[PDB]
Design a protein around this ligand. Structure first.
Ligand SMILES: OC[C@H]1O[C@H](O[C@H]2[C@H](O)[C@@H](O)[C@@H](O[C@H]3[C@H](O)[C@@H](O)[C@@H](O[C@H]4[C@H](O)[C@@H](O)[C@@H](O[C@H]5[C@H](O)[C@@H](O)[C@@H](O)O[C@@H]5CO)O[C@@H]4CO)O[C@@H]3CO)O[C@@H]2CO)[C@H](O)[C@@H](O)[C@@H]1O
Ligand SMILES: OC[C@H]1O[C@H](OC[C@H]2O[C@H](O[C@H]3[C@H](O)[C@@H](O)[C@@H](O[C@H]4[C@H](O)[C@@H](O)[C@H](O)O[C@@H]4CO)O[C@@H]3CO)[C@H](O)[C@@H](O)[C@@H]2O)[C@H](O)[C@@H](O)[C@@H]1O
Ligand SMILES: OC[C@H]1O[C@H](O[C@H]2[C@H](O)[C@@H](O)[C@@H](O[C@H]3[C@H](O)[C@@H](O)[C@@H](O[C@H]4[C@H](O)[C@@H](O)[C@@H](O)O[C@@H]4CO)O[C@@H]3CO)O[C@@H]2CO)[C@H](O)[C@@H](O)[C@@H]1O
Ligand SMILES: OC[C@H]1O[C@H](O[C@H]2[C@H](O)[C@@H](O)[C@@H](O[C@H]3[C@H](O)[C@@H](O)[C@@H](O[C@H]4[C@H](O)[C@@H](O)[C@@H](O)O[C@@H]4CO)O[C@@H]3CO)O[C@@H]2CO)[C@H](O)[C@@H](O)[C@@H]1O
Ligand SMILES: OC[C@H]1O[C@H](OC[C@H]2O[C@H](O)[C@H](O)[C@@H](O)[C@@H]2O)[C@H](O)[C@@H](O)[C@@H]1O
Ligand SMILES: OC[C@H]1O[C@@H](O)[C@H](O)[C@@H](O)[C@@H]1O
Ligand SMILES: OC[C@H]1O[C@@H](O)[C@H](O)[C@@H](O)[C@@H]1O
Ligand SMILES: OC[C@H]1O[C@H](O)[C@H](O)[C@@H](O)[C@@H]1O
Ligand SMILES: [Ca+2]
Ligand SMILES: [Ca+2]
Ligand SMILES: [Ca+2]
Ligand SMILES: [Mg+2]
Ligand SMILES: [Mg+2]
Ligand SMILES: [Mg+2]
Ligand SMILES: [Mg+2]
Ligand SMILES: [Mg+2]
Ligand SMILES: [Mg+2]
Ligand SMILES: [Mg+2]
Ligand SMILES: [Mg+2]
Ligand SMILES: [Mg+2]
Ligand code: NI
Ligand code: NI
Lengths: 1247, 474
């Protein structure tokens, strides 16, 4: 903010004066004065004499003046420039300009304190001078006058009729013009006249200048304005017709235009032009519609006829133009104009796609408060109801928001709108079709008219402020749901996936992660629904195989629970209490339940706590008083504590779900929809408590209000754990509805009885659940499941009298495996009529049948199998192959392709064999799929009978990142070659630790293997603490100064049956400073885990793209990279990953070559390896697109990728590695607009 | 989004909007509840132990049920008992169809072919689903004859009959349809609708809610960059056909700022000049300097005048002055100050929407009165770019405003057109000095304090001083 220094040199030449100014350096400042006319001076200040920047488009590039012949006198102090109209004085010490009229009258001057400087100009002038220019006023502003005597408004073009610029002038005889892209003029009534470049203005700044170029005008206003036009340009003459009257109009076609023109002409009212708004053009359409005449409105503009006919009537035509293009037509297709603009870089910088509206309609709110209004509303809805609208999604019964229209609906508007449909539909159908509605507000009483509540236009984000601050996201929704429950509206839902994004409907869809977690959450809420903004899609398969399979899996859980859930729908008709409730309902006196919203009750007997955090590796879950059983993993927890709950961030398969001891949970086979068939057997899972508990099973027609006059069915089920037996009562049937249920299968957990009695009779024992299910009439059986010992009891439902069953004794099963009959499992395929099938037409099968039709591409069967801990499970597949030769099927686990199974001929279709494969299962639910994947080279063509899954793994694994971290230990992805989603780092402070919860079947000595990195260069130590016992030293050598190298530390530990704690901690004697990845646990020697076969780093591209990986890239010198990694969720529709959250892409709009490569040293040289990957190609066919294996000892091996649009598996087998390393890669040569996606790349040791 | 606790609450009891819920219901896990019968109002709690509820003043949402008595309910029990007693007083919930426990796919942007494809995709994969909900897509919203209640058979051909319902039912799919508590009162062709006549004659509109202009058909757009020569060449190239077929003047709107939902993008200060340059350079090249360029824009920055553009004052109000009918846009009386401010910045080629653009209720709001229209026309005739404009489907022909508006408009128009050779000399002057057809008095009288901020009269060329009557009933 300092002024210029002393003049140290002055060089006159013609009409120019060049001053050198002292700034205390060898690169002195330069001030160039040029006398352009007798009354116009140009000044160019160049800090340190640097070359001037280009002038902005303010300046006329062709401006030209005659020689003035000014007198420049540098002989004294001040230096003096004179013309007949002005006298410019520059004082030497320091340099300050004074501008005067030729007669010596002072106009303006640079004050002592400072004039021109690096960021602007500063003048002083008469305090009473009137200043003009700078700014005008827009159509949304208070409109001031002409005077600018106390102004700090910026210089800008502005909006809505505004005008402005760096031009300040006075009627006292001077003007100042500064070349600038925006900036900040300043005036006040002490006499300041200043202009600052300042910070980037609101409108942006695309022309920056290091010099300060300005112009000083002397004269009367007309002379000042003429000088302004000399500098910035005069105006070209408009056509003479433009002095005439013009009629601008919006809402006009050719007939109306002709009528208007006739109207003027008939009346001798002169007029020269009509201006046509949107009407004239095909705005919204492809092929440059926003430049094309709309021949529906103006038929004669198909040719020059309209122009010529209007010209003959003396009418010229003006057309509205918007500085934008339509990037999606009315059918949601990318337009030609989009492709052209996008490929050439013609979009305004910083301006993304957005939603416009240009077709107005006029509307007015109806009043639902009036009975006659409600009758009318209903009467006009009957036709839509008859033709299929059987649920009413009543939107915007709350508030209008449109321009000046900001109207509120009253508090009873939702209730009354709901009443209109409720009363109407009930009368019209004679109470024969139940009403379903949703609204986005609730007020007491509205519930009488059969309406749910949804949470409105929530944001597509994890939480409020993650991506934008103006709407809450997923994490807030439990608090909204439970607040609604606390107001007596438990029938609640949300837009799963979110509605709003940055950029409106064109903004991004949820990431696959956000989508998957939101679906798991929504499945345990009352009104389970996806929604999105205009032309957004929310189908689960669009978000990749994890989202698809995890969403499917949790939906199967929800539908299996239909009989459980439906009792709560009945309960809401009696007490208003519904399917969800906050913990505080059950625990009014528990302070940790008082505000608790991260978990809630789903019915009376299940506590759910969905994983809602991005990249979440574990959860802290408050369990209130009682005993809780993990639904998916089987272990028990005592209540009244916060538990640490490991989750697998790699698979997304966990939905933390806990059975409340006392639970009686009716459940059934999974249907595609609620009345797809009659369910004649209802399972009842019972977890007995020492106090009696009960659940009243309920059926009715699901459809009418017949239940109101007694047409329903119920049976009270009750249970109690006694000193040495369990008693279960199935009460007498009650009510007039004949239920579909014929038998209950009681699954009584916690005891495998030696006898089951009822009414003086010991029930007939059967060998297993299958034999019991096949028996007519009552019986029992026993077994083992994930929870432990279980007793099965099959009984008739709907008896007129109560049945009391008692399970006594203890005779635990010796079974080592669970059996899953695949005919009971999930059958899918490419189309609804090409799904895998059920059959019985060959003998020798277990259970009720086997699965066939695995001989059309895409046919599959999926089993949901629970595991107590993560690890290796050898899973046996029973199958038949009477084809004459071996056949292949893919086995997928948690959406990853684990192996191609080669299934040998079994000699005949009625002869069965078994294939056992070690599967990497995760703790809790696992998704095991056997599929005919023709695009991976499978043949299909076998029949499958069942799988057998061991209750215990051969060896277990526990991820460090999911362990309980303390003392500064954290998770990270900032080094290479970790397993799972992350590793543990920052074991630096004393007390830093990772504590694992390890499960053992029996007391004894177990082997441990701890995967760790130590890149310090020297041996480091931690302590191992088992079950809080004495610390033992863990000594961890360093393989060198490289944090991408991992090793195993082996040791043993003495464990007890059940849960053990094993902590690795920096105690005060220890050095720490290692990273931990995984703890493996076995009774035998530990070998490579099935989950850890992949030799590549970041082969699945799942790493946060802030962090790098062992992948490298290449493109031709001079070409921009065509490669990146993201989720594909910004696209409409999404182009998702093959698995989990992310995939690599190659894409450019113009011709390109691109590769990525990764080199790894193999563990065993002179051995065979195998590359597998998922690849998808779309859009333009490239010249070359391939996977590549090279550097292995042999010549390059190629596998081509062909343009389809679908994910395919590419395999390069039999890689004979003799060099000790392999380069795997992907390469594309494209003429332009080829998209390749790459995901799930694995390099493994192959037999 | 807060928590569940309401220990220090003064938020009103209302239905609210956008997923909200509320009511005069305040209860505790300490063993009691209070329910007050009320239409809105003001519950109050604090940590000194207050549990209060006030009817108070009329809330934001209105109040249509007022009460002189105070009716309330006290509940005693554990939370489930309190909630059961709440349901006794305010009602239990009717059982919903059993299919509503299933998964539902809601969707906006869907027709029959896509719905069938979605359902097939779920069924093929054994992903359970019971219902699809259809947005605007399902109905003829915007059309006459109760279009906002009627199936859209362009999107859903089989909903001409019960066929769609029955085929979807066969696949285990129930259909939900979106409803808006409003009717279209003017269809796409600007005709009053049957549903308007029926609602209006029976008094079925929400009290206090006047009709208003709304939009429902989205389009996706993106701003072009006029700063780049290649972009300007492209923009002009695609304009040639329109020009050949009669668009000889370029009304360049919205070169200033985008305003759409979250999209609030500014164009830079040279956007008007460069947009203008695209058409100017292009048209001059294409016609070999044979056809003069005419343009208008709604912003100005120095230098833009080189490319043959005028300036108009934007979406001004149909009113005499700012705050006459509404406060959010200026009216007629402010316009001379805007015109003369533009002149002081070297852009004297200025115009305005004579008649005004904006009204209360948007496009469906009132036209100018005959008086406003007549005076505005007289004013406009002594300004440089003389033009009427109005909002969507509004009309500005002078004969629609009665014989005084017609005859007085005609008369002043005859004066303007008689002055063509006077005016045209000033058009030539602007090519030499930038000075145009209008100027404030202070250009001629720089030392007169009475002229220093004077805008109620101005010079029309050098030799005429004009002072239009702009006051109502003046
Ligand atoms: O004497 C009575 C008078 O006093 C008070 O005003 C005086 C100020 O308090 C005082 O600071 C001084 O103001 C100077 C200022 O110090 C100086 O920096 C300059 O201000 C420029 C910025 O330098 C320039 O960057 C630009 O600022 C932009 C900014 O870049 C942009 O990022 C954004 O934030 O907007 C800003 C503009 O709003 O422009 C400003 C000028 O607007 O010059 C100032 C004026 O010389 O002197 C003031 C009196 O002269 C009282 O407040 C005032 O009412 C009384 O009349
Ligand atoms: O690499 C240069 C590239 O960077 C930016 O885009 C990165 C983007 O690239 C890929 O997206 C492609 C799709 O794969 C193509 O299918 C195509 O998508 C369009 C699709 O064909 C239409 O049907 C759909 O409705 O609209 C989309 C366009 O929105 O084009 C996009 C590129 O725009 C890749 O799959 C993505 O993961 C990745 O984010 C930059 O935006 C590009 O302009 C640039 O070329
Ligand atoms: O952890 C955060 C870091 O993340 C990124 O680091 C990457 C690098 O980009 C890779 O180059 C590689 O680094 C290796 C390195 O290649 C290897 O030579 C070795 O480096 C030693 C070095 O030999 C030794 O003399 C001394 O300088 O220490 C180095 C390391 O401690 O080992 C590196 C790995 O440890 O992989 C890492 C990720 O592990 C990012 O680029 C870094 O800026 C960032 O710090
Ligand atoms: O104990 C702490 C506080 O106690 C005191 O506040 C009192 C007020 O004095 C009472 O008047 C009352 O406030 C009510 C008010 O009576 C009632 O009308 C309503 O106010 C509405 C208003 O009607 C409406 O038009 C709009 O303006 O919003 C208002 C609500 O914000 O509701 C009020 C309660 O919220 O009760 C309170 C609390 O007992 C004391 O004055 C405070 O300073 C003190 O902090
Ligand atoms: O492809 C495996 C398949 O082989 C036999 O069936 C062949 C063929 O028989 C009928 O035509 C069926 O309708 C088709 O679906 C079959 O492809 C075995 O009988 C069958 O069990 C096995 O799955
Ligand atoms: O009808 C279009 C949109 O309108 C909004 O008011 C609703 O809240 C959305 O659910 C709906 O998709
Ligand atoms: O195109 C519709 C309307 O768009 C607005 O941005 C313009 O300012 C109006 O003059 C025009 O009638
Ligand atoms: O000191 C130990 C730490 O050293 C380095 O910062 C490593 O990047 C980190 O992984 C490790 O935890
Ligand atoms: Ca079987
Ligand atoms: Ca790990
Ligand atoms: Ca991936
Ligand atoms: Mg010269
Ligand atoms: Mg003064
Ligand atoms: Mg600078
Ligand atoms: Mg019209
Ligand atoms: Mg005619
Ligand atoms: Mg057309
Ligand atoms: Mg769609
Ligand atoms: Mg079909
Ligand atoms: Mg129709
Ligand atoms: Ni402004
Ligand atoms: Ni609220």
């Amino acid at each position: 903010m300092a002024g210029l220094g002393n003049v140290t040199g002055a060089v006159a030449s013609g009409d120019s004066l060049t001053l050198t100014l002292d700034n205390g350096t060898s690169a002195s400042d330069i001030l160039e004065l040029d006398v352009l006319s007798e009354e116009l001076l140009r000044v160019d200040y160049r800090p340190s004499g640097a070359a001037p920047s280009p002038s902005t488009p303010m300046i006329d590039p062709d401006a030209s003046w005659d020689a003035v012949g000014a007198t420049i006198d540098t002989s004294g102090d001040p230096i003096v420039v004179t013309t007949p109209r002005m006298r410019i004085e520059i004082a030497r010490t320091p340099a300050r300009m004074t501008i005067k009229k030729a007669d010596g009258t002072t106009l303006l001057w640079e004050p002592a304190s400072g004039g021109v400087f690096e960021d602007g100009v500063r003048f002083q002038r008469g305090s009473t001078d009137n200043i003009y220019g700078i700014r005008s006023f827009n159509a949304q502003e208070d409109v001031g006058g002409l005077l600018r005597n106390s102004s700090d408004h910026p210089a800008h073009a502005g909006q809505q009729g505004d005008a402005g610029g760096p031009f300040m002038w006075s009627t006292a005889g001077y003007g100042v013009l500064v070349d600038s892209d925006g900036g900040y003029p300043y005036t006040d009534t002490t006499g300041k006249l200043e202009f600052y470049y300042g910070g980037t203005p609101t409108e942006g700044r695309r022309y920056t200048k290091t010099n300060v170029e300005y112009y000083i005008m002397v004269g009367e206003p007309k002379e000042i304005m003429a000088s302004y036009a000399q500098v910035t340009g005069t105006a070209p003459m408009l056509p003479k017709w433009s002095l005439g009257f013009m009629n601008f109009e919006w809402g006009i076609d050719q007939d109306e235009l002709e009528a208007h023109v006739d109207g003027y002409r008939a009346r001798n009212i002169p007029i020269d032009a009509f201006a046509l708004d949107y009407d004239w053009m095909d705005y919204g359409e492809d092929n440059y519609g926003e430049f094309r005449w709309n021949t529906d409105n103006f038929p004669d503009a198909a040719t020059t006829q309209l122009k010529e006919d209007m010209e003959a009537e003396g009418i010229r035509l003006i057309g509205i133009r918007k500085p934008r293009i339509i990037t999606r037509d009315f059918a949601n297709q990318r337009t030609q104009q989009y492709y052209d603009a996008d490929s050439n870089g013609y979009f305004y910088p910083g301006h993304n796609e957005y939603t416009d509206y240009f077709i107005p309609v006029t509307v007015r709110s109806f009043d639902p408060y009036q009975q006659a209004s409600r009758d009318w509303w209903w009467q006009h809805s009957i036709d839509a109801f008859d033709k299929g609208i059987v649920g009413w999604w009543n939107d915007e019964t709350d508030k209008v928001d449109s321009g000046s229209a900001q109207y509120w609906f009253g508090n009873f508007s939702t209730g009354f709108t709901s009443q209109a449909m409720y009363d109407g539909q009930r009368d019209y159908t004679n109470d024969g079709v139940r009403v379903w509605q949703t609204a986005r507000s609730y007020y007491p009483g509205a519930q009488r008219y059969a309406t749910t509540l949804w949470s409105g236009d929530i944001g597509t984000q994890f939480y409020k402020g993650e991506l934008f601050n103006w709407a809450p996201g997923m994490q807030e929704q439990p608090r909204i749901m439970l607040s609604s429950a606390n107001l007596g509206q438990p029938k609640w839902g949300m837009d799963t996936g979110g509605f709003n994004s940055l950029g409106g409907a064109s903004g991004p869809n949820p990431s696959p992660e956000l989508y998957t977690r939101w679906m798991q959450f929504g499945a345990f809420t009352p009104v389970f629904r996806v929604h999105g903004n205009y032309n957004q899609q929310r189908q689960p398969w669009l978000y990749g195989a994890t989202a698809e399979e995890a969403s499917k899996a949790v939906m199967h859980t929800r539908y299996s629970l239909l009989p459980y859930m439906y009792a709560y729908e009945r309960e809401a008709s009696e007490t208003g209490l519904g399917l969800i409730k906050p913990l505080l309902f059950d625990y009014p006196n528990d302070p940790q339940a008082a505000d608790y919203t991260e978990a809630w009750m789903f019915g009376d007997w299940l506590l759910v706590s969905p994983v809602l955090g991005e990249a979440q590796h574990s959860k802290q879950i408050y369990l209130p008083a009682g005993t809780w059983i993990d639904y998916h993993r089987g272990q028990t927890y005592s209540g009244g504590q916060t538990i640490h709950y490991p989750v697998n961030a790699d698979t997304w398969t966990d939905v933390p779900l806990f059975v409340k001891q006392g639970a009686i949970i009716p459940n059934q086979q999974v249907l595609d929809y609620v009345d797809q068939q009659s369910v004649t057997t209802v399972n009842v899972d019972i977890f007995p408590s020492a106090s009696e508990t009960s659940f009243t099973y309920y059926e009715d027609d699901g459809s009418s209000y017949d239940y109101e006059s007694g047409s329903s069915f119920e049976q009270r089920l009750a249970a109690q754990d006694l000193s040495s037996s369990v008693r279960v009562e199935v009460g007498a049937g009650s009510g007039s509805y004949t239920p579909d249920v014929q038998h209950y299968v009681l699954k009584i957990h916690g005891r495998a009885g030696s006898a089951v009695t009822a009414g003086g009779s010991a029930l007939t024992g059967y060998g297993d659940l299958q034999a019991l299910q096949a028996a007519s009439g009552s019986g029992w059986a026993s077994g083992r499941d994930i929870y432990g010992d279980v007793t099965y009891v099959k009984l008739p439902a709907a008896s007129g009298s109560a049945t009391v069953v008692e399970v006594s004794g203890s005779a635990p099963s010796a079974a080592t495996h669970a059996i899953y009959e695949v005919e009971d499992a999930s059958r899918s395929g490419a189309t609804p009529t090409t799904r895998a099938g059920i059959n019985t037409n060959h003998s020798g099968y277990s259970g009720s049948g086997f699965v066939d039709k695995l001989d059309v591409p895409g046919a599959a069967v999926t089993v949901y199998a629970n595991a107590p801990v993560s690890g290796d499970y050898p899973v046996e597949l029973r199958y038949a192959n009477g084809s004459g030769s071996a056949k292949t099927l893919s086995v997928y686990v948690n959406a990853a392709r684990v192996q191609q199974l080669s299934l040998a001929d079994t000699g005949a279709w009625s002869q069965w064999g078994t294939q056992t494969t070690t599967l990497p299962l995760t703790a809790g639910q696992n998704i095991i799929t056997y599929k005919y994947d023709s695009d991976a080279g499978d043949t299909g063509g076998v029949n499958l009978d069942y799988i057998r899954v061991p209750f215990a793994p051969t060896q277990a694994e526990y991820a460090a990142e999911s362990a309980k971290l303390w003392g500064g230990a954290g998770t990270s992805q900032d080094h290479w070659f970790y397993k799972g989603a992350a590793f543990v780092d920052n074991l630096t402070g004393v007390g830093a630790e990772a504590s694992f919860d390890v499960y053992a079947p029996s007391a004894g000595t177990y082997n441990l293997s701890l995967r760790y990195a130590n890149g310090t260069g020297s041996t480091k130590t931690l302590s191992a603490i088992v079950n809080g016992g004495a610390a033992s030293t863990v000594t961890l050598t360093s393989p060198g100064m490289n944090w991408n190298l991992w090793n195993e530390h082996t040791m043993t530990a003495t464990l007890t049956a059940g849960r053990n704690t094993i902590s690795f901690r920096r105690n005060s004697g220890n050095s720490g400073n290692v990273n931990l990845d995984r703890l493996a646990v076995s009774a035998s020697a530990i070998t490579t885990l099935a989950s850890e076969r992949n030799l590549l780093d970041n082969g699945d591209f799942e790493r946060d793209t802030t962090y790098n990986s062992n992948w490298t890239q290449w493109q031709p010198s001079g070409q921009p990279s065509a490669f990146g990694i993201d989720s594909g969720n910004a696209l409409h529709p999404p182009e998702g990953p093959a698995r989990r959250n992310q995939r690599a892409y190659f894409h450019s709009d113009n011709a390109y070559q691109q590769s990525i490569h990764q080199v790894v040293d193999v563990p065993v040289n002179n051995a065979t390896y195998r590359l597998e990957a998922k690849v998808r190609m779309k859009n333009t066919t490239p010249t070359t697109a391939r996977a590549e294996v090279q550097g292995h000892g042999g010549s390059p091996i190629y596998a081509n990728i062909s343009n389809d649009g679908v994910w395919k598996t590419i395999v390069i087998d039999n890689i004979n590695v003799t060099s000790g390393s392999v380069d795997v890669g992907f390469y594309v040569d494209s003429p332009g607009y080829t998209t390749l996606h790459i995901d799930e790349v694995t390099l493994t040791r192959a037999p």
